[PDB]
Design a protein around this ligand. Structure first.
Ligand code: FUG
Ligand code: CO
Ligand code: CO
Length: 354
C-alpha cells in the first residue's frame, strides 16, 4: 500500500508491477538496446536499494547512545528481513551489519554476549547489505552524536562523492584513487584541542561486485599509486572511502565475527560430523554470501566454533576480522553502489540523506 510508521511493508508490495525506482542517473565523465537487455538485472539492484534506503532512514530515527550494539544490529536486521521479503538465497541480507566503532573502521559486528554500549562520543560506521537474486547493494554511512566530528564526516562524504563522480567506463582505477585522496586531504579538523589533516586509510579499498560475490576481484584504491586497470561497461562497483585521524593504515584486531565461503573453492567431501553439518548449514543458508556468528546462533546452531575453525584452516571459509587504526584514532566511512550501464552511470543506492 503506502509504507507504514515503523516500516513493515515489503518493497515488492509497494511496487506491484515489479518495476522499482531508479537511483541517481549520471552522464559519464541514451537508450541502448544493450542497456535494455539487462533491465531485469538493474531492476533487482533497484529493489535491493529501495530496501536499503527505507531501512537506513528508520535506523537514523532511533539509533542513540545507551543502546547495546547487539540491540542496534538486531533491530536493523529485523527491518531489513521484512522489507527485502527474505526468501532463502533468492532475496535477503547480503552480509552482516557492520557497526564498527572509533578507531575500528570495518568488519566489526557483535558476537553473542558482547556487552558493548554505544556512547555519546562514539563514531559508528553502519555498513549493511541487501540483495535480490544475488544482486548486492553495499552502502554505508557514519553515525555520530557529538558535533566535534562534523568536519571529519564531511571530508569523507566529499571524498566518496568525488570517487563516484570520477568513475566511468574506460576510467583508470588509479586515477579514481588519486582523485579521492586529493579531496580527502584538503580537509583539516580539530577534535578536543588537537588538529589533524584527514588521511585516507591507504590499505582499505572499494571493490567490484558480482552475482552472489561481494568482492568480484577488482579493487578501487583511495590513494594514488594503484593499478591502471580500467573500469568496464556492465561492471558494478562499491565506491567506498575511509578517513582517519590516526596512522591511516588498519591492522586486524579484536575477536572475529565475519566469515565467508571462498568463491573459487569447489565441493569438498567431509566426514567429520560437526564440520560436515556446519558446512551444509552454510551452503544452504548463505552459499557464497558473508555471514556472522550471530546468524548461526539464530538458526539454532551451537557448539560450532571448532567446526568453523576447521573450515577456515581447510581454506573452505575465510575469516574477516575487524580492521582498526591505532588506539585513540577516529575513523569515518561513506559508500554507495554504482552500476556502469551502457547508457549512463547509475548511483543506485543514492538517497535524499546521502
Ligand atoms: C568488508 C569490506 O568491504 C571492507 C572494506 C574493504 O576491505 C579491505 O580493503 C581490506 C583490507 C585489509 C587489510 C588488512 C591489513 C592487515 C595488516 C595486519 O594485520 O598486520 C573490502 O575489500 C575490498 C571488504 C570486503 C569487500 O572484502 C570483504 C568481503 C566482505 C565481507 C566479509 C562482508
Ligand atoms: Co560496505
Ligand atoms: Co564495500
Amino acid at each position: 500500500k503506502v509504507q507504514t510508521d515503523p516500516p513493515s511493508v515489503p518493497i515488492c508490495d509497494l511496487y506491484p508491477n515489479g518495476v522499482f525506482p531508479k537511483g541517481q542517473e549520471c552522464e559519464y565523465p541514451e537508450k541502448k538496446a544493450l542497456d535494455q537487455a539487462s533491465e531485469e538485472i538493474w531492476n533487482d539492484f533497484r529493489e535491493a536499494a529501495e530496501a536499503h534506503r527505507q531501512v537506513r532512514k528508520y535506523v537514523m530515527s532511533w539509533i542513540k547512545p545507551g543502546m547495546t550494539m547487539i540491540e542496534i544490529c538486531e533491530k536493523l536486521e529485523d527491518c531489513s528481513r521484512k522489507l527485502i521479503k527474505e526468501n532463502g538465497l533468492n532475496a535477503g541480507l547480503a552480509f552482516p551489519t557492520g557497526c564498527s566503532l572509533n578507531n575500528c573502521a570495518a568488519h566489526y559486528t557483535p558476537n553473542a554476549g558482547d556487552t558493548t554500549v554505544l556512547q555519546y562520543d562514539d563514531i559508528c560506521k553502519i555498513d549493511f547489505g541487501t540483495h535480490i537474486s544475488g544482486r548486492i547493494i553495499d552502502c554505508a554511512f557514519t553515525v555520530t552524536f557529538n558535533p566535534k566530528y562534523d568536519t571529519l564526516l564531511k571530508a569523507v562524504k566529499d571524498a566518496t562523492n568525488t570517487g563516484i563522480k570520477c568513475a566511468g567506463i574506460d576510467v583508470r582505477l588509479c586515477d579514481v584513487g588519486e582523485a579521492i585522496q586529493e579531496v580527502m586531504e584538503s580537509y583539516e579538523v580539530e577534535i578536543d584541542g588537537k588538529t589533524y589533516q584527514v588521511k585516507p586509510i591507504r590499505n582499505l579499498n572499494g571493490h567490484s561486485i558480482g552475482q552472489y560475490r561481494i568482492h568480484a576481484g577488482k579493487t578501487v584504491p583511495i590513494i594514488k599509486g594503484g593499478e591502471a586497470t580500467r573500469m568496464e561497461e556492465g561492471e558494478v562497483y562499491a565506491i567506498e572511502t575511509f578517513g582517519s585521524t590516526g596512522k591511516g593504515v588498519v591492522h586486524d584486531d579484536m575477536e572475529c565475527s565475519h566469515y565467508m565461503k571462498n568463491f573459487d573453492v569447489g565441493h569438498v567431501p567431509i566426514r567429520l560430523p560437526r564440520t560436515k553439518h556446519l558446512l551444509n548449514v552454510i551452503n544452504e543458508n548463505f552459499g557464497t554470501l558473508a555471514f556472522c556468528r550471530r546468524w548461526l546462533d539464530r538458526l539454532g546452531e551451537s557448539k560450532y566454533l571448532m567446526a568453523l575453525k576447521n573450515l577456515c584452516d581447510l581454506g573452505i571459509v575465510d575469516p574477516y576480522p575487524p580492521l582498526c587504526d591505532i588506539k585513540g584514532s577516529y575513523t569515518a566511512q561513506f559508500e554507495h553502489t554504482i552500476l556502469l550501464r551502457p547508457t549512463c552511470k547509475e548511483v543506485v543506492s543514492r538517497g535524499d540523506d546521502y
